[PDB]
């Protein structure tokens, strides 16, 4: 029946309705946070803490909305042709500021065109990066490597640090933590897959491979 397409949209709809209270909450929290720390108020700490838990909440919802977005088979997918450099650079700006050292980028041909739904595939980079940042340990060396093997874009989010338990590295996509699973779910909908392996050097690498029907020049100028 379509009684699961009715449920799917119910999830997609409630997720979209959840943004308006977050807006009000996040706005009202910031104003409190300021208004209270403007004056000499001891509770300013408490307003500030409330702010943060609205951020955390809104992230969890921004993950729950992209999910239900791609719950309709993933024809919520506008896949333009994007410079690989600007895809990576866009994820870098969203987490590299609050970091110790920059991510080691390795892009040989940066102006490769990649076929992705830009924002959704930016979510993949951030999550693969953040999972490295969370579990690779402080002073870890995180990187990004992006070759082309066939007409498949190979993208690797690697770190030193512990790495996966050797037995089953492809179980790690089973929530500790989501976000890997969200990465699979998003890149599955894109046509590709995501595998994880320990590097010989040490640590974990996460490999994103995408089908790339063309490599457009298409006009020569």
């Amino acid at each position: 029946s379509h009684m699961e397409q009715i449920r799917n949209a119910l999830l997609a709809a409630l997720s979209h309705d959840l943004r308006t209270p977050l807006t009000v909450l996040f706005g009202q929290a910031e104003i409190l946070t300021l208004d209270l720390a403007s004056e000499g108020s001891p509770h300013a700490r408490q307003a500030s803490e409330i702010r943060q838990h609205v951020l955390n909440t809104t992230r969890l919802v921004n993950n729950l909305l992209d999910m239900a977005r791609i719950q309709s088979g993933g024809f919520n997918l506008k896949k333009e042709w994007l410079t690989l450099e600007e895809v990576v650079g866009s994820a870098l700006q969203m987490l590299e500021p609050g970091l110790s050292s920059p991510i080691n980028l390795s892009l040989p041909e940066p102006l490769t065109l990649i076929h992705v739904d830009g924002p959704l595939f930016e979510r993949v980079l951030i999550n693969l990066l953040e999972n490295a940042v969370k579990y690779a340990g402080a002073q870890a060396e995180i990187g990004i490597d992006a070759h082309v093997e066939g007409e498949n874009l190979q993208l690797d989010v690697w770190d030193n640090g512990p790495g996966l338990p050797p037995g089953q590295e492809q179980t790690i996509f089973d929530k500790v933590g989501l976000g890997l699973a969200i990465c699979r779910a998003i890149v599955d909908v894109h046509g590709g897959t995501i595998t994880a392996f320990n590097r010989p050097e040490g640590g974990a690498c996460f490999r994103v491979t995408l089908p790339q029907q063309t490599a457009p020049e298409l006009e020569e100028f």
């Binding site: 979209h16 943004r19 308006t20 209270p21 977050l22 807006t23 009000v24 996040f26 706005g27 009202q28 910031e30 104003i31 300021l34 809104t58 977005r69 919520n76 506008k78 333009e80 042709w81 994007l82 410079t83 450099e85 600007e86 895809v87 990576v88 650079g89 866009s90 870098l92 700006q93 590299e96 920059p102 980028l105 892009l107 940066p110 102006l111 065109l113 830009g118 924002p119 930016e122 457009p216 298409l218 006009e219």
Partner: protein, 220 residues
């Protein structure tokens, strides 16, 4: 001195918006509907307008279409469906900037200045690169960089719209024209060429900012 018109139906977001703007040297008007919103756009003629695309009055897209036929007030748009179709439509029909619907009192404060300094009253330089549209010569570290004519036009569009997002369509029509509505990938490559030759770290742009799903925006 600088008045804002809040066009947003949800009484909750408006009190927030009002309370936050009034905390600056600025006073606000409101409108629960798209209809009354157009009214106090005539009756008050604000310095800048904030409108959510959530209004049920009938899509707010044509509100800015209408508004722009006479007025050139900057319009900051609020996007509930933060899937970019709406934000592009708004930006294309005359909007100046956007905020995604969970937003902070900084981004609201930022994107208001950038559109009030951009609406009051020659050849500028961004921190390492000196661009001079007059003679069409561009230095990076006391050294001329040679740029294709098309590359120079694309730079010039950006360079005059400092601090304002430009959608994939605005940029194409102002570098080629209405010819290649679909052959967009050149805009992204040439922007990469501009990046590779004028940015300290091309993959970490400081001035040629990517705005994924929307377009590009030049800074500083």
């Amino acid at each position: 001195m600088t008045n804002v018109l809040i066009v947003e139906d949800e009484q909750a977001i408006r009190r927030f918006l009002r309370t936050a703007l009034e905390g600056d040297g600025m006073r606000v008007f409101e409108a629960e509907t798209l209809q009354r919103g157009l009214l106090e756009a005539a009756t008050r003629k604000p310095d800048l307008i904030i409108l959510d695309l959530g209004l049920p009055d009938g899509d707010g897209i044509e509100f800015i279409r209408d508004l722009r036929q006479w007025s050139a007030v900057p319009v900051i748009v609020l996007s509930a469906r933060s899937e970019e179709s709406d934000k592009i439509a708004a930006l294309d029909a005359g909007a100046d900037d956007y905020l995604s619907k969970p937003f902070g009192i900084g981004e609201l404060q930022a994107r208001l200045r950038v559109a009030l300094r951009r609406h009051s009253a020659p050849l500028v330089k961004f921190s390492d690169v000196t661009v001079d549209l007059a003679a069409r010569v561009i230095h990076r570290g006391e050294e001329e960089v040679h740029l294709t004519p098309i590359e120079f036009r694309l730079l010039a569009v950006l360079l005059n719209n400092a601090g304002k997002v430009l959608t994939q369509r605005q940029l194409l029509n102002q570098v080629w024209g209405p010819n290649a509505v679909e052959h967009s990938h050149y805009l992204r490559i040439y922007m990469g060429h501009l990046r590779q030759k004028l940015e300290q770290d091309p993959a970490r742009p400081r001035h040629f900012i990517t705005e994924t799903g929307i377009g590009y925006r030049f800074m500083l």
